[PDB]
Structure 1
């Protein structure tokens, strides 16, 4: 056929070692630009004035960081939510000072990862698969959108997006707890049940299937060689795993249908992480965790502290120290 049909057929080829696809056509350049910029800024970027107060934070290895302390630093509070491409700076020197790399990285990354999601759907279509892997991936993607995009929107500044760094991430979590009491928020409690329960069920299923592997090997070889790739039959006795697990608890707390069991494995963490992503995304609009400060009082009206009041003493320490030079007026309203 003609040129454009050759190109189309290559793009959507199921014979390429890595699938490209139409989503891939956007994903590849945006992920490459994000990765290249991120690697160079992490190693060599000069200090960034994150809070807009002419107090630059050093985030790169060459300016005194290690792997744990380093980061790509969010762009200046002075910028807020304004778009700050390279071409809007008078010079690269200005762009680096005000944190331009952060914007470039997050935008190319949010776009690339969104297309990574679409690319998962796209290949599943070309292979004849059911299509909902990409739904599962939407839980982590939405999480990323929350800390890098939504939360800056609600608060008015990319200076309050999550930093690209190990310690930067901790910084973000601590300040979040003081400003929103996320620990007392049900959606983050749902997220913790999501991931603890994911881990638990992960270990459970691995241990249960591993426990019922069919003897196909000797004791001097890896049990793993009892399974051959593409083999017709199952390599474990699911009836036996149910028999074990049904007795460990009781017969109906246990799954004997493989399809129902694996759907539960998918849904538990995905839902829970949807909820914690929705939790960041709504604390972005200052609907915060439950507040039980001074919620118990005695017959006279003395405050009788609870554990919520002790949490609040901690929150208050975080509140009054963070960004110690950045507040001139007594309420920290964003």
Structure 2
């Protein structure tokens, strides 16, 4: 049912085009990146604090010492990526900040869609395309898909409306 909700939002709201969803995507995908890259960094900058080949045993929850080298981590990332964290507090605040902010941004966009206040179209593109039948972009291609979604799912998805679309009015490309 949630999958249907996703698809409804594409076809009716053009939700993928909404900059608030885009900021949500960046915060979620950015959060997962931070999660993975921080865990890997810690696990591959560990200090040898025991003789075992399983390095988990050489940690003590009351030890005061850092269990991995911020210094070596910083050097690695500085040389690989150009920049690195140097401040552990900023690092972990940033990890809070990124996904929380992203989710907050997506919520704002959905508040807009409550009112059908969509980022549905680009007016400049529509003016050109109406006048110039050779003008085609990925933006116009995706609106055709939305149009398909709406006409083909509405009668069954909104049964209270009693939509009857005869075969001849369904948008369809050639052959399909």
| TM-score interval (norm. to shorter) | 0.7 to 0.9
CA distance in 1, matches of 2:120, 2:74: 41
SS of structure 1 residue aligned to 2:142: helix
User: Which runs of no fewer than 5 residues in structure 1 stay unpaired?
Assistant: 1-167
SS of structure 1 residue aligned to 2:155: coil
Whether the 8 Å CA contact 2:154–2:163 is kept in 1: the answer is no
Corresponding residue for residue 227 of structure 1: 59
TM-score by length of 1: 0.44
Corresponding residue for residue 114 of structure 2: 284
Give how far 1:329 is off: 7.0
Give how far 1:234 is off: 1.2
Q: How does 1:29-108 map to 2 (within 5 A)?
A: none
- Pairwise CA RMSD of aligned residues? 2.1
Corresponding residue for residue 302 of structure 1: 133
Structure with a larger share of its residues in helix: 2
Corresponding residue for residue 127 of structure 1: none
* Equivalent residue in structure 1 for 2:36, among 203, 219, 230: 203
CA distance in 2, matches of 1:295, 1:209: 53
Q: Number of aligned residue pairs: give it.
A: 159
CA distance in 2, matches of 1:314, 1:297: 16
Corresponding residue for residue 186 of structure 1: 19
Whether the 8 Å CA contact 1:197–1:268 is kept in 2: the answer is yes
Corresponding residue for residue 238 of structure 1: 70
TM-score by length of 2: 0.81
SS of structure 1 residue aligned to 2:133: coil
Stretches (4+) displaced over 4 A: none
Corresponding residue for residue 217 of structure 1: 50
Q: Indicate the structure whose relative CO is greater, using CA pairs within 8 Å and at least 6 residues apart.
A: 2
Superimposed CA distance per residue, residues 21-79 of structure 1 (whole angstroms, 9 cap, x where no aligned partner): xxxxxxxxxxxxxxxxxxxxxxxxxxxxxxxxxxxxxxxxxxxxxxxxxxxxxxxxxxx
User: Which runs of no fewer than 5 residues in structure 2 stay unpaired?
Assistant: 165-176
